[PDB]
Design a protein around this ligand. Structure first.
Ligand code: ZN
Ligand code: ZN
Length: 366
């Protein structure tokens, strides 16, 4: 019934009267509040000022408050401590670039954005997840790759939309590489074109290029579609917990959230996030952009519980997050009916696909 979530004190003061305060710090509150869509609307409306929220359930799973060290939980999920990469595979990286099929990218966006919404509560939201899984399965069957796996990861008992985890090279030795994007959107009429149809499309193309590649990787590569990112990042919460339980070792994580909108349609700058990411992995991404994508490299900052990468870094995994926009010249249309297909820049997505593939090759073959 009640959600337990972590919010900025800013957001708390807007929710006080409907919430139970469990623990509090100078900047954040750990609360219990039954999220109805009245409260959903408050969360959405205060998000630019007060930041996003983190659903704690994947970290504490129904454990009673009496048994929780609430303050340690609150401190460790609102702070982070920081934790060299070779680039020596130019021939392979260019081979993969030459196989990028921009039309196939665009087609994916057309499909996801044709749904009325992809909400974690709705039937269409469930279809989108099932669709994604089947796109992977089909691709692996089409290129006769047995070397693979795909499964749903339940979004607890709160949301019917599951996450989808896929992997190429299940039997490869070593720490894996993870690529992720979130499949979901808000309720109502939400094409969610830039708000991660884009990210999803980019990684789907990355997967397909990898299947059609002439060389194998020396590590497993995961491609993930997170459920319910628009619900306090709870989908990737469960996914990270699933990786922890299965003891899957992971060397690097890329988050693709909004990979398709340009503020100025011939800007071509790609922005890297500098908080809640690995600085080492981020400098690496910067040099891939300069060396291979030949793009200007910008930097930006994010609010609290910005996106799924946060669940990885909270659990000690190294994380990088390339983004379409800076925090000041934004996508003004995200979370509205106007996050439409026609807002997407295909050159921009192609560049994120390039970045992703260089990432996969230079880590995948060390
Ligand atoms: Zn969002
Ligand atoms: Zn997003």
């Amino acid at each position: 019934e009640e959600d337990r979530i972590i919010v900025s004190n800013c957001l708390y003061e807007q929710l006080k009267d409907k919430a139970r305060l469990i623990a509090q710090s100078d900047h954040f509150s750990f609360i219990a509040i039954p999220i109805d869509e009245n409260i959903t609307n408050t969360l959405q409306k205060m998000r630019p000022v007060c930041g996003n929220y983190l659903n704690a359930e994947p970290y504490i799973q129904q454990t009673s408050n009496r048994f929780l060290d609430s303050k340690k939980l609150l401190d460790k999920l609102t702070s982070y401590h920081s934790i060299p990469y070779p680039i020596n595979h130019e021939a392979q990286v260019h081979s993969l670039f030459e196989q990028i099929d921009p039309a196939k990218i665009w087609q994916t966006n057309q499909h996801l954005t044709s749904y009325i919404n992809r909400s974690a509560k709705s039937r269409t939201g469930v279809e989108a997840a099932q669709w994604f899984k089947q796109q992977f399965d089909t691709l692996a069957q089409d290129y006769g790759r047995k070397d693979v796996e795909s499964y749903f990861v339940k979004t607890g008992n709160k949301f019917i939309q599951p996450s989808v985890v896929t992997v190429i090279g299940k039997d490869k030795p070593g720490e894996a590489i993870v690529i992720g994007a979130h499949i979901d959107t808000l309720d109502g009429n939400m094409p969610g074109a830039d708000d991660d149809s884009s990210g999803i499309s980019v990684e789907l193309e990355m997967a397909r290029v990898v299947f059609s590649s002439n060389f194998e990787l020396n590590r497993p590569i995961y491609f993930i579609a997170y459920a319910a990112e628009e619900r306090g990042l709870i989908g990737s919460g469960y996914v990270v917990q699933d990786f922890l339980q299965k003891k899957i070792p992971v060397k690097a994580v890329m988050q693709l959230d909004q990979a398709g909108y340009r503020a100025n349609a011939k800007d071509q700058t790609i922005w890297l996030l500098k908080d809640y990411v690995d600085k080492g992995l981020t400098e690496f991404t910067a040099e891939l952009l300069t060396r291979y994508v030949k793009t200007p490299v910008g930097y930006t900052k994010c609010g609290y519980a910005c996106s799924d990468h946060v669940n990885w870094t909270n659990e000690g995994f190294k994380t990088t997050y390339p983004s379409a926009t800076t925090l000041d010249d934004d996508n003004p249309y995200v979370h509205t009916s106007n996050d439409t297909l026609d807002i997407l820049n295909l050159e921009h997505m192609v560049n994120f696909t390039k970045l992703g593939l260089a990432f996969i090759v230079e880590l995948g073959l060390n």
